Scaffold this active site. Structure first.
Site, PDB file in Angstrom:
ATOM      1  N   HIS A  41       0.803  -1.226   0.000  1.00  0.00           N
ATOM      2  CA  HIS A  41       0.000   0.000   0.000  1.00  0.00           C
ATOM      3  C   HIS A  41       0.845   1.290   0.000  1.00  0.00           C
ATOM      4  O   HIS A  41       0.260   2.362  -0.071  1.00  0.00           O
ATOM      5  CB  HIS A  41      -1.072   0.032   1.108  1.00  0.00           C
ATOM      6  CG  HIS A  41      -0.550   0.127   2.511  1.00  0.00           C
ATOM      7  ND1 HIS A  41      -0.083   1.329   3.038  1.00  0.00           N
ATOM      8  CD2 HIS A  41      -0.492  -0.820   3.474  1.00  0.00           C
ATOM      9  CE1 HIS A  41       0.268   1.061   4.286  1.00  0.00           C
ATOM     10  NE2 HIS A  41       0.053  -0.218   4.593  1.00  0.00           N
ATOM     11  N   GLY A 143       2.533   6.002  10.211  1.00  0.00           N
ATOM     12  CA  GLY A 143       3.928   5.855   9.815  1.00  0.00           C
ATOM     13  C   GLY A 143       4.612   4.607  10.336  1.00  0.00           C
ATOM     14  O   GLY A 143       5.786   4.387  10.049  1.00  0.00           O
ATOM     15  N   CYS A 145       3.634   1.484   9.567  1.00  0.00           N
ATOM     16  CA  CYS A 145       3.416   0.386   8.615  1.00  0.00           C
ATOM     17  C   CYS A 145       4.775  -0.083   8.131  1.00  0.00           C
ATOM     18  O   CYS A 145       5.665   0.743   7.889  1.00  0.00           O
ATOM     19  CB  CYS A 145       2.537   0.831   7.446  1.00  0.00           C
ATOM     20  SG  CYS A 145       0.959   1.586   7.927  1.00  0.00           S
TER      21      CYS A 145
END
Ligand code: PJX
Ligand code: CL
Lengths: 305, 300
Positions: A41, A143, A145
């Site tokens: 993503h 942030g 991920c």
């Protein structure tokens, strides 16, 4: 003495954390050999995340669109491929800090350490369990991920989790290092809900053995139970079934404390039907289910890494 | 979202852990630059554990009596000195993995991460608070002596604790990195008992603000209190007094959530009187006191 949550030492994983930027999105990547792994993503925008075609978005990208930063050094991407929900960015430089590693998929109830990162920089380490509903009760802000979950086995890091998203209830969802999600989740902005969670029974029993090893014995009783009678009670209190494998796994702890697994189950059964009565076990008023039988043995014996 | 007890990444400290052996005793040392720090009780024999004269035992030692091992490499001790309860072994090699560091002495209520080691090898990392009675509730076995407590606030490691001993109640006592013990403890096997422990009130309030930030509001009430009325109630529950400094420190959290400190104090009084009634706060059925106001702001 003492019993604490305790994570694996994070040093071997810290030397792998990098910052991955694509367009406006910045998240974390895992740099192992000449490959940087991160959630796919990162290639998404706001319109894209609603209904994304990752093959189509990725085909429009070039290597120079990915900015990879290892410390204050920019790595150059020389290739890009996608494996399930994980993006693989081939780089020109192999990570000199690459430890001995493996990608392993874990089962619900198994525990692992999370190295929470922001902008490729590790900020904290915590121990958690893969819930039976396949979520993790993590602690993550925007942030984070690409932050990874791992275990250490001798001198080998087993990477078992990568963070992808947060569900509406504040719980977390992610994938193994092959991009396969844990649970019935998808990597897009849509209505998603975690299933009703259950207690990891074998882990509670392991934590009761840890309490006995530390001298907390008030909950012990003269009784024993059949595995079938225990499971009939466990199902009733939203507790995971206890298998013969779980009983076998609790064997060394049973042998060490002198309390048979079915005898400890009878303590657990009474604890569920009657409660703690204002008492605590290992300083807790709730039954802890995020210590596996291996974790209890490792901590109450001093295995090092 | 989410709230976890979270330790600092231990990598910067792992690259400093070494094994220190003197005679039959083996414990952990902290290798920074060309100095290895470790508890001075490594020089103690069976006869010298109740009333050891460390100056006398150390003067009888030579550099070749200390075996220092960094990984599979034996370091050569070229000097030895003692600073309070810590032994400093000068070595002939500077640690190339030495991070930016500082030695800081902490106050009760302060939190820090512990890198538990055995034979110079890190085995686990966990979070602790320095208890008001100056003990820590660690998880330590024989051999863990010399394991360190630290904080990594941006780039630099602040070493604040070195493990020395376990008290009869299973709690732990140690020193800062200058060898000064936290608490009224001595590095002797003499009869020692930790004082009655108390709850770190400011930390519980910080954790209640963390819960409000995460959407848990059930415990909030329409009451406020005076600081003096709060302290009179809290102390009956073995809670530490809340000072004006603590109130000031909770200011940013109060401003962020819209709940005044004395208003949150009234919610704390109510919780102590009623208990949780089967409810939890941040997945806990007890009030957590090992998250400082600085930890809460950092994690949230
Ligand atoms: C009585 N004794 C024994 C060795 C050492 C000691 O307590 N160390 C240990 C450390 N951490 C956990 C433990 C858990 C079980 C046993 C020892 C543990 C020690 C050190 C000093 Cl300064 C004085 C006395 C003393
Ligand atoms: Cl803990």
């Amino acid at each position: 003495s003492g019993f604490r949550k305790m994570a694996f030492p994070s040093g071997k994983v810290e030397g792998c954390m990098v910052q991955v930027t694509c367009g406006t999105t910045t998240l974390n990547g895992l740099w192992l050999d000449d490959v940087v792994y991160c959630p796919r993503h990162v290639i998404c925008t706001s319109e894209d995340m609603l209904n994304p075609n990752y093959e189509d978005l990725l085909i429009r990208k070039s290597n120079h669109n990915f900015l990879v930063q290892a410390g204050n050094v920019q790595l150059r991407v020389i290739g890009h491929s996608m494996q399930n929900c994980v993006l693989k960015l081939k780089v020109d430089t192999a990570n000199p800090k690459t430890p001995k590693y493996k990608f392993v998929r874990i089962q619900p109830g198994q525990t692992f350490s999370v190295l929470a990162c922001y902008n490729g920089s590790p900020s904290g380490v915590y121990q958690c369990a893969m819930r039976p509903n396949f979520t993790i009760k993590g602690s993550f802000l925007n942030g984070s991920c690409g932050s990874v979950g791992f275990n250490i086995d001798y001198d080998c890091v087993s990477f078992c989790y990568m963070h992808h998203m947060e569900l509406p209830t504040g719980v977390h969802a992610g994938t193994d290092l092959e991009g396969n999600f844990y649970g019935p989740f998808v990597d897009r902005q849509t209505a998603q809900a975690a299933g009703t969670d259950t207690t990891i029974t074998v882990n509670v029993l392991a934590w009761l053995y840890a309490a006995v090893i530390n001298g907390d014995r008030w909950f012990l009783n003269r009784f024993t139970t059949t595995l079938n009678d225990f499971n009939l009670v466990a199902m009733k209190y939203n507790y995971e079934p206890l298998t013969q494998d779980h009983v076998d796994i609790l064997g060394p702890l049973s042998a060490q404390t002198g309390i048979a697994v079915l005898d400890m189950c009878a303590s657990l059964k009474e604890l569920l039907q009657n409660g703690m009565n204002g008492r605590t076990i290992l300083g807790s008023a709730l039954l802890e289910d995020e210590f596996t039988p291996f974790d209890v043995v490792r901590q109450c014996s001093g295995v090092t890494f």
